[model samples]
Target: ADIVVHPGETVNGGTLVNHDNQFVSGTANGVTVSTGLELGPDSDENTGGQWIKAGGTGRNTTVTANGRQIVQAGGTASDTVIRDGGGQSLNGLAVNTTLDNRGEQWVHGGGKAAGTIINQDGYQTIKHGGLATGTIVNTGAESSGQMVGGTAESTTINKNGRQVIWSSGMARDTLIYAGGDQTVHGEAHNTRLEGGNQYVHNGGTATETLINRDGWQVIKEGGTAAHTTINQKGKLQVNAGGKASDVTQNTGGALVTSTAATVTGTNRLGAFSVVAGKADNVVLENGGRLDVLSGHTATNTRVDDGGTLDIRNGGAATTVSMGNGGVLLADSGAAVSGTRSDGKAFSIGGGQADALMLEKGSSFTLNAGDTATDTTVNGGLFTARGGTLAGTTTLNNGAILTLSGKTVNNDTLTIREGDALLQGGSLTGNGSVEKSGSGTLTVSNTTLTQKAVNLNEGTLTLNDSTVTTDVIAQRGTALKLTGSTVLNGAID
Candidate 1:
């Protein structure tokens, strides 16, 4: 068929037939024929067998093949690949709301997949259904729904079937994971990662450092009613190798814990202590229990008003061991209370120091029925205001163990205070009282150690109290009374 090159052209098809028929036209115009069968831009011989051949400059245009789609190249649909020498692009690809790649190839972007490949207004899902091979690349940020995201009921991500979560970046309020047995394998900054309620365990055999802005990390319940019940905030990090080899360090943060919630700093049996700084204050409020199992040797440590620290079965049971030059002051506002069993035997078995040292402003107030009864060697000062010490208190006189005894106990009550008044619970352990010049030991009973009632200006008042034990005072310090100095014993 001869086609006109000018704008005006027509196809008067008077049985236009040849063994290989052709329709030739110029670039300006071509044969214009409207037919019943649809002829797309690149229809092959099987569909409306149309053919076009051009030997000129080709511009941009859409070329769709009718009744044919490119399923493969050089092979069947089982294996297909699309590669380019310089550049290629497929912008705004839209399908019938469902696109299954089906092992196909659509190589896009000009040698760089750095643009938004799939921008969807709604949900997008990439499911690797039981396939052992898969790869995905997000050239941009990967986001989820508004409220909850990345919810996997029973899914697993693994390296050689060993599931893991890893990142090498800075995250801000970044929710990296939420599940059971979640392990973080690198350093994270302000990462809010948690685990579910029935159980949540975090372990890193390698090093894991969790840095918090204000020392806030946690493990909490996720259910509706008791969801936030067991909340803990400590910036607490863990290491699993039983040594500090690749330990995780959680920076200082206030740990607010609830019932049945325990946040431990060390995962193994080792001494865990912060560096010597005054910024350390640990509190266990409102029946909360804190156990410091490691032997504590400190320059100073303070337990707040309501805080309670239980040191069980360690050296001397528990101690407020202050440095020799340091001072141990129990704030009267905050009572420092403790207990040691009377029946328990042993005298600092490892040859440790005394359990407590109270300084000038320091005072030991033992509550009613809650007593400290230890007759072992004491190296520190023990002072009491209204406090009751039930122990056989051995005082190092130079250390100044003053007792204003509202109540005292022991087989022998050696007066640690010069002006210490005789109150109740006094001198009951087959006891005797000895008074020194700088140290006074007062006894209401005379003739204690098979000796007569000896007295001086120290003044042994008589019959004011009956004495079952003997009393012996040194020369010029005893027996000053206007009345007869009554010695209530088998007088010599």
Candidate 2:
């Protein structure tokens, strides 16, 4: 056919071959493009002109691309959709019915695209009254639209492949299954999951997860996801649910941003639960509140900041346990590390101080309220940086309370402003307490039942700070007051 402008030439379903033959001018209008031979852009000479090419050498079909190049687009047109492999040329493959990459990388895009290939880019509302497997991927750099869903039993959408729902821009809420598993791989470079109302978990697991692959950087939870489970290997951000069951076990960046937090319904134990993996880095700051009710017990959590771990509480009670060999430091605004003016007694360190495994030079402090409850750590280096801890101070077992080599392990330690009131418990430790620098180690108003107040170094000062508590040191203890003040009952 030299020149054929066959208008309304309806071929229900047939094959048109033009390999050995020659076709000069032909108009393909109202003709459905099937997946078979290459189209207009299969040329020998490099015309240098822009052409809609699809599929080059192998597999032949412009649609299903194999490992080889599918579409090598040229020219300056911004819209180009190559379906299959084509040895990296200006080719276009259009699988009219559906484009199923089937976990295969189809289109290998060059710097430039020749023409456009628009698929069925329409809106479809899917209401999952039941469950469904598999996933719907958006591989483009960006996808903007909507997905709405009502309710369902329980749906599990496994994005086993990375970049399932990737959007360079905001992917408007596409109501997916009402209940199911939504897993996001950690390899999604700049990916995010946006808006959603209620993800009802009928009788199944409702999870919105992001598991990092190899070289994943960051993934932000841009919108609200209620009744959703998010487990990620990258640094994740959520407004609430730290003490919840879903947020546990992670080998990645920080758990939650200190500023992006809230106090949900009080359950007693805690509102946010965090499990510190190997590379653990976390911070709770800027009025980020966490309240522990009653039954909930939060234990074995460390605050080790390769950076600074600032746990700033504006009168909100946060139950913090500086894990064994961990450090818990509370620094006031001024230079006064440990000092009070209210005329009240204080034990400004771990209440039940314990931290035997902590590397040397770690510190612990208890500021604010003069009366602190029972504070305790299992093992870690400790220090009462500043402030007053007014209460029964008891360090049991292996808690190493030290400052500059002077350690007081398992010692009934106390720093008082007036009279000490030994409530009940006993402090036992293998380590010793040496009050050095500007801070003072005193046992006032309580029965100091320990082996020794062995002041080997540093200063053991007895100021206007009174002590109804007895100072019982070990028999062979060295109580040296080197340039340090010690005022006994003072010839009373």
Candidate 3:
């Protein structure tokens, strides 16, 4: 029991006795050693209870219950297996280590581990100043694995595996597989979830995350996610006290932003996005759908071609500019107004709008139980079928104000092309019809009970229709009436 250190001694497949009180400085190869300190310059302890001190190397070391393997600074270990009730503290370098149920591996400062496999109930702690790369948090058949902490990079989390980056820890380029999750309490970058989940906890920051099908990027209270793309049925949830910025949701993506959460600068090219929180500076390109939840506010939004802006059922919105090819669909209990208006507005069941603008591509239609006030029809196909049309409608530049059997507040139809169509619908208002541009006003099965009709340069064809106009005045050049028609109004 008086064995000590040797500079370059080699023990080939020999057994170092238990309670030997020996320290190895020379190479100990294939040695069977028991509970005691094992120091080595290059050593291998297999099928033995062991500990590796600084400046030592241990390979194929098996740590049993009540045994520990410590690879101190400047030491190295590989292929070490720690079973139940075994513990390994690594402050140096480790490769191809395995931890089983109840087995533990604690990596400290100056410690770097590569390719450590952790089974169910096995634990690996990467503490501050520790770096772990290429670690696989594995799971058994329907089993679960967990990982949390340190400077983790390039890690893969398999089914039922989870990795949590606590405060003071960071992660980058992690791959989360099905049923896996990465929770960030500090920061994570470029984390991709393939049918997995990435949860940004309070005070956590996640950047450039890609969420695929069945994948979710959830931002909890005080969490922040930037430049996250939700695609292919991937979902993004910004809960109360969460914040999201510059998120682009493409086709097959979904967004649910709730109260007290704020979203800034989100662009949508397709799919549906709901806003119950405060959203600012949004742009909806072709095929986007914006559903502003009731009592929520959406500011500075642009609805471009093929985009639909739906602010129905009580959401407050400001500065929304609707461009051509954009659509506005609404029901009752919602309101949309501002210098921010354009495109074609339609009413599905019941709707209301103030200061609305219907664009030149055959404008809009409002059925029963709908109301629009202070609205302008540029191309004026304002077909009011039992809905309420209140205020002045300016039909400028070949705009036709088509009416359909509804008693509107105003009857003034001003057409620069001097054309109006009241086919299969009636126009009974207190205002006059001013047609200016050189277009045709064809009428069939229609009635116009306005105060007057100014037919300046276009032709008016009336067959199964009648206009109770006080005066039909021709201004510019031609006011030709055809179709075997009859008028009960004056021709001035």
Best by TM-score: 3
Per-residue lDDT of model 3, residues 1-492, tens digit only: 544435556444444445443344554444444443333212345322344556666677665554466677777777877666466778988888787875667788889888888777666788889888888877532412444567888888888677878888898888888888888898899888888889999999999988888788999989999988878667777887788877877655656554356665444533223345655555554344456677776666566665556664666666676766655544335555444342344232227656566555434556566776666665535666676666655655444545555645464556554445556676677777666666666666667677777676666666666667765556554554566556775687
For model 2, give the 10-residue run with minimal summed lDDT.
Answer: 333-342
Each prediction's TM-score versus the true structure? 0.27, 0.33, 0.57
Write down the lDDT that model 3 would get.
0.65
In candidate 2, what are the lDDT values of residues 363-391, reduced to their tens digit? 34433322233343333333443233322
Judged by lDDT relative to the true structure, which candidate is superior, 2 or 3?
3
- Superposed Cα deviation of residue 488, candidate 3 (Å): 46
* Model 1 worst lDDT run, 10 consecutive residues: 78-87
TM-score, ranked from best to worst: 3, 2, 1
Q: Please report the TM-score between candidate 2 and the true structure.
A: 0.33
Clashes of 2: 68
